[PDB]
Structure formats: structure tokens, C-alpha cells
Amino acid sequence: GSSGSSGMKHYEVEILDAKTREKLCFLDKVEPHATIAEIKNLFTKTHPQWYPARQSLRLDPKGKSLKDEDVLQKLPVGTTATLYFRDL
Numbered sequence: 001g002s003s004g005s006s007g008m009k010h011y012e013v014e015i016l017d018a019k020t021r022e023k024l025c026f027l028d029k030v031e032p033h034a035t036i037a038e039i040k041n042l043f044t045k046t047h048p049q050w051y052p053a054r055q056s057l058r059l060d061p062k063g064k065s066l067k068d069e070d071v072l073q074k075l076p077v078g079t080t081a082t083l084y085f086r087d088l
Contacts, residue, residue: 018061018084037068056086
């Protein structure tokens with residue numbers, strides 16, 4: 001049933017691969033004002049061994065590398081943002 005439930009209006013960011021486009025990490029608790037830079041930090045939480053200096057995010061698999069400047073609210077995306085990872 002329902003028996004009461006807490007609703008979170010957080011952002012949904014599914015970090016997929018730029019090759020196999022396979023779900024690597026799902027952050028449904030990201031802030032809108034959070035800058036790309038912060039995004040990286042998160043992914044690190046779970047996997048500390050993986051540093052940001054590597055994790056390469058890109059709005060598209062055939063575009064360019066994203067920059068902190070960009071924001072989950074400034075980007076040409078909505079509540080559900082999609083980022084592509086690229087092995088360095």
C-alpha cells in the first residue's frame with residue numbers, strides 16, 4: 001500500500017559509457033545547482049579508487065568534455081541528465 005511515503009524531488013543523473021553505454025552509476029540524489037565538478041566527487045564516494053582526473057564526462061559520445069562551469073540546471077537537459085564516461 002502507501003502507508004505514507006517520502007517524495008524526493010532530486011535530480012536523476014545516469015552516468016553511461018561512451019562505448020557500451022552501460023549503466024555504471026546512478027545518482028538520483030544530485031542537486032540542481034551542483035556543478036559538473038561536484039558530480040565527479042559523487043561517483044568517487046562509492047568508488048574511491050577512481051579519481052576525477054580520469055572520469056571524463058561528455059554531453060554526447062561525439063561531442064566534447066564537460067566543464068565545471070556547466071550545471072545540472074544550466075545544461076540543455078532537464079531533471080533527468082545523461083552523462084557519458086570515457087576511459088583515459
